[PDB]
Symmetry: D2
Subunit: 362 residues, 4 copies
């Protein structure tokens, strides 16, 4: 019997650990049982965002202190998914997943259950290709069993921190005779997010294996997962995977539902995600623990037949604008901008859309 | 002689695109001699160095001068051109064209859409953001109301103004004449100009008493504001251009206008209340929308409903750009259409962090 | 016998025609003899820079009124090449080229000569490909003929305006079943700049045709022109060519010389360009009419072994940075930041460098 | 008899300490003798730049484990001044100041000396006002004695890290009923830079006290220090001062010289600074250890009467542009873009100019 608790903590800066320090000193959280931390940090969420690593370093230093272990050890034990980009009204915050297995009669029905798994370090020429998909698809199966979920349909969200291609990993693949998927480091964020997402779909039964190839990755937008949520960063060379869903063998005081935004202003999907997780009135909104969603600019350059400038705007990266938009739309349904939104939804929802999950109190 | 107002919301492909307007003129839907105002969203950055505003105005004036057989300057003396740059997020560039026909039909029963237009005099740089701007806008608002044949200020639902800003050259002109300007910063001057103009609206409509407004109150006392004023700064004029929109009992328009006030940037309730005030009482009637017109801003607390955001601390992206993307996305998500007018910088336009929102709808 | 006069005119804004009208009203410029105007305008110099079209519309409208002809006839007759982006201390300005027929003695030696030619409009799928190369090369030859220059060694600068891709144009292409050269609007500027530059190298014999193919464009940086200077813009669908050199059939009181900057801080190359124009001492800098240069971020991410973030900065596009840098370097050598610097030097000088030309009074 | 050594070390990211550690592992740096680290970090150098604190955290975390002590005591013992913003070709790097007492002979001539001092913490309502000026001026006199410099004319550079105002800090001052010096986060950096620079002028006797008042700060540009170089940051409440000059009680093999750039393209002042540091020809450039300069946009919006858009550009803040410009000018003179340039030179050199120092081997 594993129980899961989730703490959404406001943060004053990327290195702010006080909110997690207040819940530990109070005993509401025992640090030894922390399995993952999902963060929105206030850099630009693109290539040169060092708030990701700053936030992970600051958290790792704090937990190594309170657990008496080394920073490197904490990194191997706890999944740090730091997603940069807090545009518009999006509030910086972290979500701390605690997994405490306690003996107790199991909640009839199904309750929140979380699994984590790491993949091996990829080679740069394996970034954004079938070997990233297959490897990620494997680790998702192992994280899914570590959560005590057997049916791939009890899964409602799969977060992933994935690597990207830097100038050194290009040369660290060129002098071995290997070409990389793309030359632009920014473009490799799309290829890393996308290949990782096709891994979720492959292991969850959403898309058959015959369809997936090198040429499909970031090209056949008909292929996509409905629960995958991948975020790239420079501070790593493997993929870290968090599987969230519902399990009969769970005692959590929480459930997780989801839906899929058809486009960036699909407030209907926000409300359906809310209803899939036991929130059906505007008064029950106070049971939200967090809302987690993908955003992206549609490749057509339109939303509902209306042109926008996201793909033409040379001043502001289109992932920055997508995040601002989708956060604002979710904020306006739940009346709270402190919700996880991440940009670049390659193979995560249809082109121009992305999955959205709500974790709510029962 | 009976005023009929027709409003056309026209998507644009670029700042200089006149093809949608020309299609309506070529089909006979719009007589170009009856155009009184054009309200634009142009795809520049909406801040200091936004030249899409002047580009779109020059393009529209050139085109209409050619259709009308008159000079560009004559067109600009006769037609309000209000271009608000900044189409961030999913916001769709477009123009809204106000046409005032004189028809041979009685006024429609009840009150219907009416529009009036008035220009102030040119302002010296040392008048921007001070009482001379406030009082001059107030007089011009009153003139536009009479233009519109609206007698009751409560029948005014949206006042759109283009206002000037301070450039380095204008500031230097004022210093050479011995005068100081309200602020020594072009970007900040947009706020004072927007703010003074909004207070002229409030003064003219009686939303605020005259003895509450003074130089020191401007862009400081946020308790003072208009609930219908929407003001936008640009480098391209030295005066204010005023469009008063409301409903008159002497109108044959097939349209009406309603409004509410957003209390903050994610106030979807205020969008629905403005829709209802314009007669749209359900999702299926949303197809009667002609346009939605809203003001957006970064609250001075640096928060929304107690949640911190980075708008006021973000040195890479100006906060008025963020406010526009946010409020446009919030409206897009209620009405299902991102091609709506949203303008940033809501000083004395609704509460701190909020702004007026109007809806023009078919009856 | 042609005589060319060049006027460098500071501007207060993209639509500022007052400096030009003052020279027309004073009798210094016969507007009917203007053959080209080359501008630095204060937009961002990228995809969504509309100051370029604003400037061209304002100049075309002004000249059309002064000549009693239509705007369309002005643009068919005069080359308008507006290069956006006035970063750092670079000063917005236009350079106006006037060409007059004169009966004058055989000016000893060779003197400034200018030729103009336009290509047909391109379809979006032809940008960055051999169709563009080949059509630009044909236009370059016509421009040389227009300039009465027979020897390609007497050509010192070839300025081109060329189109780019927007989201809307890429969708038009797809809807016709065509694949564009790259799906990135920003990167489309580099393909269009690079293909135009190879068109110059092909026409001048700097590179033989059998070395140029679609796969070489924006990949083989060892193919380049030493005099090409190309600039992309949303405001036109063809290429406009200005060829600038010296010919024995010219009565100009000006000459043009050039060099190639090897990297973004190559002040040595600025001084060689000056010497090549006859400016043999610091006391003779007053004969400068204008300096014209290309700037770019090197693909290696480095300058003389030193790393910079130009290729990694998701907040500022690297062509903005490169323009700021090269303008600052030239400015510090000639004492004047009002010089023409354009960014993105694909196939224009070596990787990380670009041509630099000086127009000087003899 | 003090001995100062200085090490300019390239960095690969804001948290890169491997260059420093290589010098420590090799025996060339005793980590216990480091008194100051001056860095350029690749954030945006403005308000929301977290690379400054990321770098400081990493270095403090590294030195502490090296010396066996806590972080709190490393930051109390070593001055960390991280200046963000590496635009243009400016290369990220840190400059490490090692100082140790020696029993050496009296070396004729004066030689590099370094002193350090910290001020008390400032309330938000004190930045940009006389409390900051006078407390900085007191700490400058203390750093001078720590450097064993008793003649202000032997001070060549005074580097300062100072605070700034965020929205949250401004809103807190309101709650407490206190008004701040300006209600703009970005503009608050200028006031804090400027009050600190005036602190240096007052301490060195460059400006007499009766000239300084709250009204003069960031208004009277005739008031300035010729050696002050100040840099604001979101990650501290006080000011840290490094005084760099020459002392007869020095056994350093280095010297420092300086000059004042009269504007952003004043290459003549770079060469004067080099010549004042004993570098008399181009063949002696190899003796440069580092160049340190302040850059800024002039309040007139011009350079030598030529307009630029640094103060007009709502997409790029003017300190970003100034740093790119001045770094490129210095790089073109010395052949190396890995030099320290900092933006915003309020009361540091004349309006539009700033001090520039050179540390060189004798
Ligand atoms: O939203 C996102 C997407 C990503 O790829 N990396 C980030 O840091 N934030
Ligand atoms: O002041 C304003 C507000 C806006 O949103 N766009 C503009 O061009 N001016
Ligand atoms: O610097 C440049 C390069 C370009 O491609 N197009 C422009 O307008 N400016
Ligand atoms: O150059 C600078 C100036 C400043 O004030 N703060 C920074 O981080 N960098
Ligand atoms: Ca998608
Ligand atoms: Ca307001
Ligand atoms: Ca090149
Ligand atoms: Ca200065």
């Amino acid at each position: 019997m594993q129980k899961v608790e989730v703490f959404r903590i406001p943060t004053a800066s990327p290195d702010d650990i006080s909110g997690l320090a207040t819940l530990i000193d109070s005993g509401k959280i025992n640090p030894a049982e922390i399995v993952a931390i999902l963060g929105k940090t206030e850099g630009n969420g693109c290539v040169n965002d060092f708030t990701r690593g700053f936030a992970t370093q600051s958290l790792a230093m704090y937990l190594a202190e309170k657990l008496g272990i080394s920073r490197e050890e904490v990194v191997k034990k706890v999944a740090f998914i730091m997603s940069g980009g807090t545009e518009g009204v999006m509030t910086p915050h972290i979500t701390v997943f605690v997994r405490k297995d306690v003996a107790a009669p199991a909640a009839p029905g199904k309750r929140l259950a979380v699994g984590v798994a790491f993949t091996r370090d990829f080679l740069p020429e394996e970034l954004g290709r079938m070997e990233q998909v297959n490897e990620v698809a494997r680790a998702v199966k192992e994280a899914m069993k570590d959560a005590q979920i057997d049916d791939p349909r009890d899964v409602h969200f799969v977060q992933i921190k994935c690597p990207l291609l830097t100038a050194e990993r290009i040369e660290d693949a060129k002098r071995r005779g290997k070409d990389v998927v793309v030359n632009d480091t920014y473009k490799s964020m799309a290829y890393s997010r996308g290949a990782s997402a096709l891994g979720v779909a492959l292991a969850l039964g959403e898309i058959s294996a015959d369809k997936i190839s090198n040429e499909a990755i970031c090209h056949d937008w008909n292929l996509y997962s409905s629960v995958a949520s991948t975020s790239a960063g420079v501070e790593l060379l493997n993929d870290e995977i968090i599987v969230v869903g519902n399990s009969t063998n769970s005692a959590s005081d929480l459930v997780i539902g989801h839906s899929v935004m058809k486009d960036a202003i699909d407030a209907d999907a926000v409300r359906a995600a809310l209803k899939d997780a036991g929130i059906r009135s505007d008064d029950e909104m106070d049971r939200i623990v967090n809302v987690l969603a993908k955003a992206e600019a549609a490749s057509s350059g339109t939303v509902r037949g209306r042109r926008n400038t996201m793909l033409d705007d040379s001043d502001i990266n289109h992932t920055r604008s997508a995040r601002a938009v989708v956060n604002a739309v979710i904020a306006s349904v739940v009346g709270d901008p402190m919700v996880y939104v991440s940009g670049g939804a390659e193979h995560q929802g249809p082109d121009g859309g992305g999955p959205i999950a709500v974790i709510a109190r029962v």
